[PDB]
Design an enzyme around this catalytic site. Structure first.
Site, PDB file in Angstrom:
ATOM      1  N   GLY A 187       0.776  -1.123   0.160  1.00  0.00           N
ATOM      2  CA  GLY A 187       0.193  -0.083  -0.343  1.00  0.00           C
ATOM      3  C   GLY A 187       0.967   1.184  -0.300  1.00  0.00           C
ATOM      4  O   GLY A 187       0.362   2.355   0.120  1.00  0.00           O
TER       5      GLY A 187
ATOM      6  N   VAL B 290      -1.672   3.974  -2.422  1.00  0.00           N
ATOM      7  CA  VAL B 290      -2.422   4.698  -1.748  1.00  0.00           C
ATOM      8  C   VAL B 290      -2.331   5.525   0.147  1.00  0.00           C
ATOM      9  O   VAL B 290      -2.409   6.264  -0.601  1.00  0.00           O
ATOM     10  CB  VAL B 290      -3.121   4.109  -1.465  1.00  0.00           C
ATOM     11  CG1 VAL B 290      -4.551   4.577  -1.169  1.00  0.00           C
ATOM     12  CG2 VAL B 290      -3.195   2.001  -2.484  1.00  0.00           C
TER      13      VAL B 290
ATOM     14  N   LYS C 189       8.875   9.393  -7.465  1.00  0.00           N
ATOM     15  CA  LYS C 189       9.530   8.232  -7.716  1.00  0.00           C
ATOM     16  C   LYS C 189      11.317   8.224  -8.039  1.00  0.00           C
ATOM     17  O   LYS C 189      10.538   8.107  -9.486  1.00  0.00           O
ATOM     18  CB  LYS C 189       8.346   7.823  -8.409  1.00  0.00           C
ATOM     19  CG  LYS C 189       8.186   6.232  -8.558  1.00  0.00           C
ATOM     20  CD  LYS C 189       7.769   5.097  -7.411  1.00  0.00           C
ATOM     21  CE  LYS C 189       7.866   4.159  -7.834  1.00  0.00           C
ATOM     22  NZ  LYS C 189       7.096   3.099  -6.218  1.00  0.00           N
TER      23      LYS C 189
ATOM     24  N   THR D  99       9.542   0.416 -11.899  1.00  0.00           N
ATOM     25  CA  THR D  99       9.285  -0.782 -12.243  1.00  0.00           C
ATOM     26  C   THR D  99       7.667  -1.154 -13.058  1.00  0.00           C
ATOM     27  O   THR D  99       7.010  -0.273 -12.573  1.00  0.00           O
ATOM     28  CB  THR D  99       9.651  -1.989 -11.521  1.00  0.00           C
ATOM     29  OG1 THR D  99       8.783  -2.898 -10.966  1.00  0.00           O
ATOM     30  CG2 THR D  99      11.287  -1.555 -11.310  1.00  0.00           C
TER      31      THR D  99
ATOM     32  N   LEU E  83       4.239  -8.150  12.225  1.00  0.00           N
ATOM     33  CA  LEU E  83       5.054  -7.469  13.090  1.00  0.00           C
ATOM     34  C   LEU E  83       6.760  -7.767  13.196  1.00  0.00           C
ATOM     35  O   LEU E  83       6.950  -7.114  13.077  1.00  0.00           O
ATOM     36  CB  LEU E  83       4.477  -7.906  14.780  1.00  0.00           C
ATOM     37  CG  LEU E  83       2.656  -8.226  14.665  1.00  0.00           C
ATOM     38  CD1 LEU E  83       2.605  -8.747  16.133  1.00  0.00           C
ATOM     39  CD2 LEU E  83       2.230  -6.986  15.151  1.00  0.00           C
TER      40      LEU E  83
ATOM     41  N   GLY F 106      -1.278  -0.242   5.520  1.00  0.00           N
ATOM     42  CA  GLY F 106      -1.891   0.316   3.606  1.00  0.00           C
ATOM     43  C   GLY F 106      -2.865  -0.518   3.936  1.00  0.00           C
ATOM     44  O   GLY F 106      -3.990   0.556   3.045  1.00  0.00           O
TER      45      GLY F 106
ATOM     46  N   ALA G 256      -9.526   1.575  -0.508  1.00  0.00           N
ATOM     47  CA  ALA G 256      -9.403   3.037  -0.416  1.00  0.00           C
ATOM     48  C   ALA G 256      -8.443   3.596  -1.861  1.00  0.00           C
ATOM     49  O   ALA G 256      -8.962   4.324  -2.595  1.00  0.00           O
ATOM     50  CB  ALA G 256      -8.154   3.413   1.151  1.00  0.00           C
ATOM     51  N   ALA G 257      -7.835   2.775  -2.557  1.00  0.00           N
ATOM     52  CA  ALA G 257      -7.930   3.016  -3.629  1.00  0.00           C
ATOM     53  C   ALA G 257      -8.728   2.486  -4.775  1.00  0.00           C
ATOM     54  O   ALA G 257      -8.120   3.158  -6.153  1.00  0.00           O
ATOM     55  CB  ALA G 257      -6.255   1.871  -4.396  1.00  0.00           C
TER      56      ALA G 257
HETATM   57  O1  LIG Z   1       5.577 -21.158  11.790  1.00  0.00           O
HETATM   58  C1  LIG Z   1       4.624 -20.363  10.722  1.00  0.00           C
HETATM   59  O2  LIG Z   1       5.063 -19.412  10.504  1.00  0.00           O
HETATM   60  C2  LIG Z   1       3.236 -20.885  10.604  1.00  0.00           C
HETATM   61  C3  LIG Z   1       2.466 -20.955  11.626  1.00  0.00           C
HETATM   62  C4  LIG Z   1       1.454 -21.326  11.448  1.00  0.00           C
HETATM   63  C5  LIG Z   1       0.313 -21.398  12.543  1.00  0.00           C
HETATM   64  C6  LIG Z   1       0.733 -19.600  12.545  1.00  0.00           C
HETATM   65  C7  LIG Z   1       1.867 -19.694  12.232  1.00  0.00           C
HETATM   66  C8  LIG Z   1       2.901 -18.930  13.128  1.00  0.00           C
HETATM   67  O3  LIG Z   1       3.384 -19.653  14.085  1.00  0.00           O
HETATM   68  C9  LIG Z   1       2.980 -17.347  13.104  1.00  0.00           C
HETATM   69  C10 LIG Z   1       4.342 -16.458  13.971  1.00  0.00           C
HETATM   70  C11 LIG Z   1       4.491 -15.769  13.844  1.00  0.00           C
HETATM   71  C12 LIG Z   1       3.292 -14.596  12.765  1.00  0.00           C
HETATM   72  C13 LIG Z   1       3.326 -13.201  13.111  1.00  0.00           C
HETATM   73  N1  LIG Z   1       4.569 -12.137  12.622  1.00  0.00           N
HETATM   74  N2  LIG Z   1       4.959 -11.483  13.142  1.00  0.00           N
HETATM   75  N3  LIG Z   1       3.195 -11.172  13.055  1.00  0.00           N
HETATM   76  N4  LIG Z   1       3.229 -12.167  12.981  1.00  0.00           N
HETATM   77  C14 LIG Z   1       2.416 -14.760  12.441  1.00  0.00           C
HETATM   78  C15 LIG Z   1       2.035 -16.833  12.501  1.00  0.00           C
HETATM   79  O1  LIG Z   2       6.235  -1.152  -4.953  1.00  0.00           O
HETATM   80  C1  LIG Z   2       6.115  -2.370  -4.676  1.00  0.00           C
HETATM   81  O2  LIG Z   2       6.641  -2.813  -4.054  1.00  0.00           O
HETATM   82  C2  LIG Z   2       4.983  -2.946  -5.807  1.00  0.00           C
HETATM   83  C3  LIG Z   2       6.467  -2.963  -7.796  1.00  0.00           C
HETATM   84  C4  LIG Z   2       5.169  -3.178  -8.913  1.00  0.00           C
HETATM   85  C5  LIG Z   2       5.699  -4.053 -10.213  1.00  0.00           C
HETATM   86  C6  LIG Z   2       6.995  -4.622  -8.941  1.00  0.00           C
HETATM   87  C7  LIG Z   2       7.079  -3.678  -7.482  1.00  0.00           C
HETATM   88  C8  LIG Z   2       8.481  -3.372  -7.010  1.00  0.00           C
HETATM   89  O3  LIG Z   2       9.087  -1.945  -6.971  1.00  0.00           O
HETATM   90  C9  LIG Z   2       9.640  -4.591  -6.838  1.00  0.00           C
HETATM   91  C10 LIG Z   2      10.234  -3.924  -5.577  1.00  0.00           C
HETATM   92  C11 LIG Z   2      11.423  -4.500  -5.227  1.00  0.00           C
HETATM   93  C12 LIG Z   2      10.855  -5.985  -4.922  1.00  0.00           C
HETATM   94  C13 LIG Z   2      11.824  -8.028  -4.247  1.00  0.00           C
HETATM   95  N1  LIG Z   2      12.252  -7.138  -2.627  1.00  0.00           N
HETATM   96  N2  LIG Z   2      13.325  -8.514  -2.377  1.00  0.00           N
HETATM   97  N3  LIG Z   2      12.975  -9.146  -3.914  1.00  0.00           N
HETATM   98  N4  LIG Z   2      11.819  -8.674  -4.593  1.00  0.00           N
HETATM   99  C14 LIG Z   2       9.651  -6.445  -6.099  1.00  0.00           C
HETATM  100  C15 LIG Z   2       9.167  -5.738  -6.294  1.00  0.00           C
END
Ligand SMILES: O=C(O)C[C@@H]1CCC[C@H]1C(=O)c1ccc(-c2nnn[nH]2)cc1
Ligand SMILES: O=C(O)C[C@@H]1CCC[C@H]1C(=O)c1ccc(-c2nnn[nH]2)cc1
EC number: 6.3.3.3
Lengths: 226, 227
Positions: B15, B18, B38, B42, B147, B170, B201-202
């Site tokens: 986001g 936006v 900007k 890309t 987080l 966003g 919102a966009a």
């Molecule tokens: O282990 C995983 O990745 C998958 C598990 C499957 C069930 C919930 C997942 C989990 O544990 C999990 C860990 C960190 C966050 C997070 N971090 N920042 N914001 N939220 C969100 C999910």
């Molecule tokens: O601005 C955006 O996020 C959306 C644009 C829309 C078209 C491509 C997006 C872009 O520019 C973009 C920037 C960094 C990465 C990245 N970072 N690490 N690996 N790949 C991937 C995409």
């Protein structure tokens, strides 16, 4: 002591569990004794059990955990929804240290990404890695945005002097595609790419997963871990 | 000069555009002159034009681009596919400096996340913010995993003494599930949440987008951005 490796990721659902299983399988086939520790597990209500995955895929029996929470949320949120605290920092660090023994590869699987709170107050897998003197294997995706999340994660490791044991792409697509192929080449310019597990590897039976794991990792790197 | 804000994010498609439009709209309704630049765009072969979208949504006329690449990829990859080079670090700084103006809020929208390379060698938006002494507004999602990415991004900012201007969710769903509600309360404790833009919102038209933008931000914070 032996070798302790925390297996973290750039975020959630990136392949941490299947990478833990794959490295455990590869290490066992090299003759290394493997233990896997999942201190905190969430999403048990829908059946999540990462340790059981590792046991079925790689045959590991030393599978240690401390807490299980029903909600599929971040550990701190799953704990709060259940009305029960996360485990203590001492609980996690000492469990890992008691698992550790010479000749053994002890893998520690985190929940979500590196800075996720695993214990109170605000203890993360990065803190745990410092405490047990473990290096960090970082599971990454091949998708759009992985280079930024990888760089952020590696800088957070270096900020607390946690060594990076390398990267693993948790799911390599077939056919790859333009973004996936570009990302794999760029990821290797950031850190050492130890393996790229084929997409769908988590569904293999134990025999197929072992063949996949043995080919996915460099044998000299695996044996050199202990 | 005036106030320069780099608008970064926890990643791609969170986001940034936006939020740039929403803050631009909110500042313009407070009488603040707004410019949006900007440095690297890309996906032009797909029709991506964040500057054009920001002008369309918020009515910003002072829009400044620099590098444009066809493929919807990371800047380094999109440039390589087109056989083109990334801009120089000083080229991005010159782009922003020429917009900077007392009484003006100049927003610098990034591409992807904070550590995305925008100039060779490995120059990111964080480096740019240090060069122009800009604070960083971080756009985050309410989704699972936000987080961790937010904490990683804020730590990267602190590592180079780039002040965090706050967070903006966003896209805020209505109704929010347990995860989204939990994430918002936790986000507000990690840093100051400046706004949470409603989902979709966009797709609002000019009138509705301005009304949403004004309601989304604290008027005192926006007014205090530029003296
Ligand atoms: O282990 C995983 O990745 C998958 C598990 C499957 C069930 C919930 C997942 C989990 O544990 C999990 C860990 C960190 C966050 C997070 N971090 N920042 N914001 N939220 C969100 C999910
Ligand atoms: O601005 C955006 O996020 C959306 C644009 C829309 C078209 C491509 C997006 C872009 O520019 C973009 C920037 C960094 C990465 C990245 N970072 N690490 N690996 N790949 C991937 C995409």
């Amino acid at each position: 002591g032996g070798t302790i490796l925390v297996v973290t990721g750039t975020g959630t659902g990136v392949g941490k569990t299947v990478v833990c299983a794959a490295l455990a399988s590869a290490a066992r086939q090299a003759g290394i004794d493997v233990a896997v520790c999942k201190p905190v597990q969430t999403g048990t209500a829908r059946g999540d059990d990462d340790l059981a995955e590792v046991g079925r895929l790689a045959g590991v029996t030393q599978l240690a955990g401390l807490a299980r929470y029903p909600q599929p949320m971040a550990p701190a949120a799953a704990a709060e929804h259940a009305g029960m605290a996360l485990p203590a920092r001492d609980q996690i660090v000492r469990l890992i240290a008691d698992l550790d023994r010479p000749g053994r590869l002890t893998l520690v699987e985190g929940a979500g990404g590196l800075l996720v709170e695993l214990a109170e107050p605000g203890v993360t897998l990065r803190d745990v890695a410092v405490d047990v003197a473990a290096a960090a294997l970082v599971v990454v995706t091949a998708d759009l945005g992985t280079l930024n999340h990888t760089k952020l994660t590696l800088e957070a490791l270096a900020a607390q002097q946690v060594s990076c044991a390398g990267l693993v792409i948790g799911s390599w697509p077939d056919p790859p595609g333009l973004v996936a192929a570009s990302n794999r080449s760029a990821l290797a310019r950031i850190a050492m790419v130890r393996a790229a597990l084929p997409a769908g590897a988590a569904s293999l039976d134990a025999g197929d997963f072992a063949a996949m794991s043995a080919a996915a990792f460099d044998r000299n790197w695996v044996a050199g871990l202990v």
